[PDB]
Amino acid sequence: ATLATKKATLVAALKDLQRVTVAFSGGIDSTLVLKMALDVLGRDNVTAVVANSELFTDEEFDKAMSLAEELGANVQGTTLDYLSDDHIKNNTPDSWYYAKKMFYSRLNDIAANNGSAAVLDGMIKARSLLQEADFFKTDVRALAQELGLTNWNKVASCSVSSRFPYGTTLTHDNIAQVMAAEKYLRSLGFPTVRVRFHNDIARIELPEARIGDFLVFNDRVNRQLQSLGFRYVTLDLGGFRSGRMNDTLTKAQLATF
Amino acid sequence: ATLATKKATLVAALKDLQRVTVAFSGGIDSTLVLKMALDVLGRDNVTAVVANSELFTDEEFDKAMSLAEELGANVQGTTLDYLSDDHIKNNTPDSWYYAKKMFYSRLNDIAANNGSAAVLDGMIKARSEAGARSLLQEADFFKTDVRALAQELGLTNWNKVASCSVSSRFPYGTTLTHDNIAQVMAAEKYLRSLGFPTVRVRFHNDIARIELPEARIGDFLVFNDRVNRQLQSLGFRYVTLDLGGFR
Amino acid sequence: ATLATKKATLVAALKDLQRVTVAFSGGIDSTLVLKMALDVLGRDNVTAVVANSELFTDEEFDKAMSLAEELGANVQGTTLDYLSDDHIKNNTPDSWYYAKKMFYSRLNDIAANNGSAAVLDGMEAGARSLLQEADFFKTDVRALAQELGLTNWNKVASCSVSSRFPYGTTLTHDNIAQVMAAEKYLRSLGFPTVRVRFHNDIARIELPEARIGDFLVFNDRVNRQLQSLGFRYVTLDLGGFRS
Amino acid sequence: ATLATKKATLVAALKDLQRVTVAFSGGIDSTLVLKMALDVLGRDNVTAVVANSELFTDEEFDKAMSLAEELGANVQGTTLDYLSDDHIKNNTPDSWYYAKKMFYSRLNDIAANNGSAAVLDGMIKKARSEAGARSLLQEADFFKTDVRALAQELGLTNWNKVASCSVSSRFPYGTTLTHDNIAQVMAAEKYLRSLGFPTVRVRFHNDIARIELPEARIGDFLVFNDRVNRQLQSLGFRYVTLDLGGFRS
Amino acid sequence: ATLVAALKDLQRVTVAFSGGIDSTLVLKMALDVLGRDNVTAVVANSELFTDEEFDKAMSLAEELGANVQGTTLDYLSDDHIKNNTPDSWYYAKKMFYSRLNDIAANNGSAAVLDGMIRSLLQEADFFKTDVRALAQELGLTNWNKVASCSVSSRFPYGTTLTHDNIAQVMAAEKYLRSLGFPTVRVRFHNDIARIELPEARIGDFLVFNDRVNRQLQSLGFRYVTLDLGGFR
Amino acid sequence: ATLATKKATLVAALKDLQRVTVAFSGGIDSTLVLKMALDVLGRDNVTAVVANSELFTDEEFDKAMSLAEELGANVQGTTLDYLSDDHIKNNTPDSWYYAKKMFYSRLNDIAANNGSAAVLDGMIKRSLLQEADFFKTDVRALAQELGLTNWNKVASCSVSSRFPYGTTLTHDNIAQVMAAEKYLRSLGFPTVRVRFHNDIARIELPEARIGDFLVFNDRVNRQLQSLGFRYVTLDLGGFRSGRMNDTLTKAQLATFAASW
Numbered sequence A: 001a002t003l004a005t006k007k008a009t010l011v012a013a014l015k016d017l018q019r020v021t022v023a024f025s026g027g028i029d030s031t032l033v034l035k036m037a038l039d040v041l042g043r044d045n046v047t048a049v050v051a052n053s054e055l056f057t058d059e060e061f062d063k064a065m066s067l068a069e070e071l072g073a074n075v076q077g078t079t080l081d082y083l084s085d086d087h088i089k090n091n092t093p094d095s096w097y098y099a100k101k102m103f104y105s106r107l108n109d110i111a112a113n114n115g116s117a118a119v120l121d122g123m124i125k126a127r128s129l130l131q132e133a134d135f136f137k138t139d140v141r142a143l144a145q146e147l148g149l150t151n152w153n154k155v156a157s158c159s160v161s162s163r164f165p166y167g168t169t170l171t172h173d174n175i176a177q178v179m180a181a182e183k184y185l186r187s188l189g190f191p192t193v194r195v196r197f198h199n200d201i202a203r204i205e206l207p208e209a210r211i212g213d214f215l216v217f218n219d220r221v222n223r224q225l226q227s228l229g230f231r232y233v234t235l236d237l238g239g240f241r242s243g244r245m246n247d248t249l250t251k252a253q254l255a256t257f
Numbered sequence B: 001a002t003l004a005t006k007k008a009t010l011v012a013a014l015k016d017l018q019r020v021t022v023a024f025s026g027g028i029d030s031t032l033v034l035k036m037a038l039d040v041l042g043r044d045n046v047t048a049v050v051a052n053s054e055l056f057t058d059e060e061f062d063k064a065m066s067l068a069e070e071l072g073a074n075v076q077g078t079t080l081d082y083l084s085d086d087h088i089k090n091n092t093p094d095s096w097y098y099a100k101k102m103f104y105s106r107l108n109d110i111a112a113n114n115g116s117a118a119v120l121d122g123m124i125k126a127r128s129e130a131g132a133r134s135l136l137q138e139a140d141f142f143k144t145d146v147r148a149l150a151q152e153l154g155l156t157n158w159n160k161v162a163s164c165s166v167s168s169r170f171p172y173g174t175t176l177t178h179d180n181i182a183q184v185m186a187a188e189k190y191l192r193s194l195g196f197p198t199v200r201v202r203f204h205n206d207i208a209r210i211e212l213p214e215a216r217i218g219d220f221l222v223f224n225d226r227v228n229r230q231l232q233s234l235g236f237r238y239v240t241l242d243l244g245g246f247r
Numbered sequence C: 001a002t003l004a005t006k007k008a009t010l011v012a013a014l015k016d017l018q019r020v021t022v023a024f025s026g027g028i029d030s031t032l033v034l035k036m037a038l039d040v041l042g043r044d045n046v047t048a049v050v051a052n053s054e055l056f057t058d059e060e061f062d063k064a065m066s067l068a069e070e071l072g073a074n075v076q077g078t079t080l081d082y083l084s085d086d087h088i089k090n091n092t093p094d095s096w097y098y099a100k101k102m103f104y105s106r107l108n109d110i111a112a113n114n115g116s117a118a119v120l121d122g123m124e125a126g127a128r129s130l131l132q133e134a135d136f137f138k139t140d141v142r143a144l145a146q147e148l149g150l151t152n153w154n155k156v157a158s159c160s161v162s163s164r165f166p167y168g169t170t171l172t173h174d175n176i177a178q179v180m181a182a183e184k185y186l187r188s189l190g191f192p193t194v195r196v197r198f199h200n201d202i203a204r205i206e207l208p209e210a211r212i213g214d215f216l217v218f219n220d221r222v223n224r225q226l227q228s229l230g231f232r233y234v235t236l237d238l239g240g241f242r243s
Numbered sequence D: 001a002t003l004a005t006k007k008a009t010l011v012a013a014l015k016d017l018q019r020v021t022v023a024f025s026g027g028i029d030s031t032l033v034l035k036m037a038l039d040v041l042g043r044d045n046v047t048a049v050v051a052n053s054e055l056f057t058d059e060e061f062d063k064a065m066s067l068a069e070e071l072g073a074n075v076q077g078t079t080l081d082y083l084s085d086d087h088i089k090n091n092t093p094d095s096w097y098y099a100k101k102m103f104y105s106r107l108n109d110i111a112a113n114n115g116s117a118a119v120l121d122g123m124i125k126k127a128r129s130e131a132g133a134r135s136l137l138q139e140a141d142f143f144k145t146d147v148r149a150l151a152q153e154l155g156l157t158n159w160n161k162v163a164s165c166s167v168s169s170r171f172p173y174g175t176t177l178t179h180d181n182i183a184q185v186m187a188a189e190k191y192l193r194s195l196g197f198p199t200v201r202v203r204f205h206n207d208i209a210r211i212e213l214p215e216a217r218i219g220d221f222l223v224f225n226d227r228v229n230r231q232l233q234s235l236g237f238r239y240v241t242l243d244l245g246g247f248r249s
Numbered sequence E: 001a002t003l004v005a006a007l008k009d010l011q012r013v014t015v016a017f018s019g020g021i022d023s024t025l026v027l028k029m030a031l032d033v034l035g036r037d038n039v040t041a042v043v044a045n046s047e048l049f050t051d052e053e054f055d056k057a058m059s060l061a062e063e064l065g066a067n068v069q070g071t072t073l074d075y076l077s078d079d080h081i082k083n084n085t086p087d088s089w090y091y092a093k094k095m096f097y098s099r100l101n102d103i104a105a106n107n108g109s110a111a112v113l114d115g116m117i118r119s120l121l122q123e124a125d126f127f128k129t130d131v132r133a134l135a136q137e138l139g140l141t142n143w144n145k146v147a148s149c150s151v152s153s154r155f156p157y158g159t160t161l162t163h164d165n166i167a168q169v170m171a172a173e174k175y176l177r178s179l180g181f182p183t184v185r186v187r188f189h190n191d192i193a194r195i196e197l198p199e200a201r202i203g204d205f206l207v208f209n210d211r212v213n214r215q216l217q218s219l220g221f222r223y224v225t226l227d228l229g230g231f232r
Numbered sequence F: 001a002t003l004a005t006k007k008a009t010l011v012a013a014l015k016d017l018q019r020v021t022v023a024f025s026g027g028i029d030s031t032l033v034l035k036m037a038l039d040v041l042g043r044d045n046v047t048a049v050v051a052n053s054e055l056f057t058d059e060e061f062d063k064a065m066s067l068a069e070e071l072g073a074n075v076q077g078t079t080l081d082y083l084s085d086d087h088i089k090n091n092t093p094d095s096w097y098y099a100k101k102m103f104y105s106r107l108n109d110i111a112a113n114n115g116s117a118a119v120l121d122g123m124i125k126r127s128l129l130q131e132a133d134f135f136k137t138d139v140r141a142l143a144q145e146l147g148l149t150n151w152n153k154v155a156s157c158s159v160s161s162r163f164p165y166g167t168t169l170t171h172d173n174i175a176q177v178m179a180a181e182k183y184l185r186s187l188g189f190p191t192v193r194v195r196f197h198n199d200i201a202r203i204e205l206p207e208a209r210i211g212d213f214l215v216f217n218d219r220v221n222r223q224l225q226s227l228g229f230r231y232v233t234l235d236l237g238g239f240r241s242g243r244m245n246d247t248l249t250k251a252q253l254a255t256f257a258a259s260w
């Protein structure tokens, strides 16, 4: 298929849906879906929903709200207490699924009460219209430039649950602890970082190519994260996303581990 | 002349050509030519061609194809066997000219079979042995004129650093083979994967000599052992780092 | 407010001014104002003024003049003799105010003699800072520039060379040239954010702390090059840049 | 307050004891006591005991045995099962005292068997007092400079210059020590020292290894990051980390 | 062994003892050849040398079994030393050796001996390798392994030395050595400290940049810098 | 078993030899033999021979001569022309054996003319240390016992190791390599190799020092270029490659190396 027919199929789904609620993350995919829904259905038939929670930063929430307002959409923030679900609070390995379940359950509630016919999300190759129309990554960038979309959150965040071992209980304080630690490291010029939480040990993951520059901050980072509540502040020798940059022989050894 | 005149004339040349095939590298120049062709003639009358070969990386090829796709052009990959020409195979100083010759000859074949009236490249003020046309250079475009018109048209994305031919990593007179080319390309691909986008693996038979910008060599130390063993599995006996730095 | 609202606030202000003179430094902010002024009012109603002086680099001046032409503006160079004011010449702590005064006084002269309704800056009261009137933040400046296709501007700005001298030290053509050659060489090695602070026979180099690790490979060349410029001791500040 | 008077006191206490067993660590203090006992009492009246256990490396044990042999002493190794005491096994803060108590209790068994009149230690001027072990250097009012002065006088130039600690220092209070995690810690430290880092600790935090190095060596350590990461993981750690505080942070 | 014959001729000696290997051998040979009661070891105390260097030398001379005597010199009372002129070394040498001769005259010593390589050790054609062999030979295991120079080297010529700026320089260098950099100078330029390190250690130093910056500032410096030329 | 037993064995071998010539390099092993020979047999019954040749530095020769004198031995320098043998001259893979052969022939000639019954060398586990079951740890333990404090702390090899097999040795390429190594040691790197690959110099450093080397990159590059090299490079495996790696990547660098 061509981009023109991939765009066809998508206007057809929106025209048929009439009124929609869109899960808006601020990324290129949700930006394109939100912009196409606005273009095809008009401002009065689209409501953009951005989720706020303890497992995502306030900064990403504020940015997502401002991006959706920019597109000229009616935007609604909704607050989720993910920690009320025991799977999330005790970080079971399927915590991801119960968070998504609670997330989509609240969007469906919003959509039922605003008269929207469906919830739309960004997913590419609830209704993922881009993925139904066989949109690839190259197709989303082509139509975004085509429609003049230049602004979107370029950095996709994870759930802070990523920083805790399975079985570790998440609390309001340890979450804030991890997030303050990561925010401080980014302020020193390390935008890609993780502070992994191991109770009284902080284990920092950095891209290995920056480990060398970092040394000048060892003492400042050590004492700052200690005031955040950690007793031991450490640097993971494997780096961020360990094993990914290794030779063929030691990539199959780190992966077997 | 004013920029509008240089642009206006360029639109006139495109209007007269009606249908064009564009040699697309991904740089600022070819991006500007491809965008003007799409604007003046429409998507159905423009074909973007990106060359794939043993002397250039798959990554550079994919980026150029995706950029032409991102501009709304119908883009077409074409593969050239540069090593079938003895001038390129034996890495003579004029190997570049026979490579450009072979590319422009294949561009004319593509244009003949799609009904294009001319081939366009990004050259600014072998290309004429093939009758390919530099429309920017006919319209008296300079580098500042190219950036001025690109900003005017909203072009923010293009390959900012033109990559070189891998023949650059072998001394003149060294015979290029599929194995030594593949060896160098895998080594550079591995080094770039570690976060060193500007890197050179110069080939000295059983010695690999790595050129890095001096300002990044400090950052490299953590990878010494992994780079040493990886390039040895590629076939090198000694893996070395040039103390002089890049170029 | 949305960016569209802030943009409209700015198109309206420019439309009301009709004719403007723009103090153009080449940075992201001055690039956005100059491009918006050209877009709303047209080339014939906008004048780009680039200041040439001894306290800012020739490189900064050359880039700004060619960038203003690349944006399609009529650009005009003006030269300011900052060292003619004794506060600047002897680098008293209020030297900045007299420098800004002399600059804005010359822009107002340029605007009066071409009939511009105001002087606009990138950010005096005789000038209008339209971006801050429309409540533009740094993130907004970036967004609107990407929206309009603006890709070229000086990404690191060098400021006034007077900042490199202690208060009370007299600025001279030779010590200025000494500092400027030293900083020019360091930037040539790949350090665009740098200061060479002048302490007579001591050079005190400020670098962003995250770059000092990478700098070691240049110690000996930097030492010998800055000594040939006239320094006797070439040092690196352990506090880093902005110490 | 004279060195000659302090030595005189030492030969008198040894002469009076007649037969002794000496707890020999290989340090300057135990070397000086062992050398003075040999000179005053003769080789047949002195037995040097070196402790072998899971909490010290085999290299440290072999070194002490050969050092005691080099002084001309009859030396006998004895092995202690420290992990049999619950205080040592579960790493309570008094583990040192129960380890030392068990050590001194075994010394008295050896001394009772060979007819020694006392057990002698290196201490200079806890569970030693309960066991009746004698600090002759401390009774003769030996200070550190007095021990160095007499060692120079006797030609003693060789002794362990760095006394190592119990491996228990690498485990948190409350963590249970096992034969495997001890072996894990010791192999990790042995590998790091082989790379040229003689002062190092691998602190044990279950699935995390936390390496303490002197901060002045951390810069040079970078070249070994990947090799250290994968080697300590093959020893059983899941995460291999470097303490940003450095050694003894 | 030109050495033992030279000592017998002096009969009674006072030894200028610095605590280094050279001075350590002289005191030990003098004590052995002439006896404890006929040798007097003098350790100099002054503002231009570290307390640690002095304390080690006094305690080490006692540990060798010698009668040790401290003597205090006020080098800054000499105008050449106080204003750090280029010949300050020579006027310092005068005060040091003049006070030893007073002590030697007052205890009946026949001469003052120093180390180097009346330096009887240097007269016997001893090299650096010869000093290490003979010290182990006599069981000598202890001595100050790092000899410091006069603190005056850290000040520019013409700068007036004060009790405070000397102490300032001494505390700064004491701090840097504590971090594992035994060869270091902090050169004094009023409000600027200029640190000299061996170039091979500058990489290893980076981890201490911030702590060194804040520590030397509390010592009184406003600017704490690292010399790109390295040490000497 | 014990050190006293192994040492006792040595004095017995020396007493039985009566008169000895000692091949003295200045290292700990030869220093131990030379001092024990002097101690057991006396100065008049031991002869120390130090070899000087074109494949070893003047500094190594001078240190060995000065150290053996410091132990009180009668020392004799002898000069070997290794380059006169074509196997050494053209750096064949067995060049080591013809060099050792020519060396030992001259020691035996010296020993015949001194009335010595054998030549003694420093080999460990007539190599008396190796016969007396001395290991590296026993030689270090016994050396401290006798007060041996001075010896060549970093033993250099023959310069032939710095050339690929088949490369012809000349005074100019030898002087080129040795000058490069002496310059690097002058910067504070006592263990270094400058391997010669025609227009490429490949520097081997202990991996624990390479980060510290960055400050010298430019000076080393330009200095070795004035020595005649066109490219000055650093081996990423370092000196003694593969000996410090982890378990799995040591056995893989083993099959990498044994592939040539």
Ligand SMILES: NC(=O)c1ccc[n+]([C@@H]2O[C@H](COP(=O)(O)O)[C@@H](O)[C@H]2O)c1
Residues within 6 Å of the ligand: A096, A158, A162, A163, A194
């Ligand atoms: N199972 C899923 O579909 C899913 C989705 C999103 C995130 N995650 C989690 O995100 C984590 C990734 O961690 P980092 O991105 O911080 O490195 C993984 O633990 C992964 O389990 C999982």
Ligand SMILES: NC(=O)c1ccc[n+]([C@@H]2O[C@H](COP(=O)(O)O)[C@@H](O)[C@H]2O)c1
Residues within 6 Å of the ligand: B096, B164, B165, B168, B169, B200, B247
């Ligand atoms: N004629 C061309 O189009 C062209 C362009 C860029 C580089 N080159 C070649 O690339 C080489 C430079 O190699 P490096 O950029 O890897 O250093 C030169 O030999 C040069 O001849 C040729």
Ligand SMILES: NC(=O)c1ccc[n+]([C@@H]2O[C@H](COP(=O)(O)O)[C@@H](O)[C@H]2O)c1
Residues within 6 Å of the ligand: C096, C159, C163, C164, C195, C242
């Ligand atoms: N006092 C002011 O309003 C004013 C204005 C502009 C610049 N400055 C000076 O600019 C200098 C900036 O120094 P840097 O060289 O570190 O950027 C400071 O001296 C600062 O005082 C001051």
Ligand SMILES: NC(=O)c1ccc[n+]([C@@H]2O[C@H](COP(=O)(O)O)[C@@H](O)[C@H]2O)c1
Residues within 6 Å of the ligand: D096, D165, D166, D169, D170, D201, D248
């Ligand atoms: N209480 C004691 O007398 C005693 C004795 C031996 C070791 N220790 C322990 O040794 C530890 C120090 O060992 P590290 O070298 O690993 O830091 C301390 O926790 C200290 O409590 C204590």
Ligand SMILES: NC(=O)c1ccc[n+]([C@@H]2O[C@H](COP(=O)(O)O)[C@@H](O)[C@H]2O)c1
Residues within 6 Å of the ligand: E089, E149, E153, E154, E185, E232
């Ligand atoms: N001029 C002399 O004869 C003499 C004698 C002894 C020491 N010194 C001093 O030793 C100093 C050595 O300087 P450093 O601080 O770099 O070690 C010289 O500056 C010099 O002032 C000089």
Ligand SMILES: NC(=O)c1ccc[n+]([C@@H]2O[C@H](COP(=O)(O)O)[C@@H](O)[C@H]2O)c1
Residues within 6 Å of the ligand: F096, F157, F161, F162, F193
């Ligand atoms: N019998 C032997 O194999 C033997 C003996 C002595 C020296 N060598 C040579 O000495 C070299 C040592 O090389 P480097 O010390 O320079 O690294 C060996 O690679 C080897 O070429 C070999």
Ligand SMILES: [Mn+2]
Residues within 6 Å of the ligand: A212, A213, B215, B216, B218, B219, C213, C214
């Ligand atoms: Mn870096």
Ligand SMILES: [Mn+2]
Residues within 6 Å of the ligand: D219, D220, E200, E201, E203, E204, F209, F211, F212
């Ligand atoms: Mn180092």
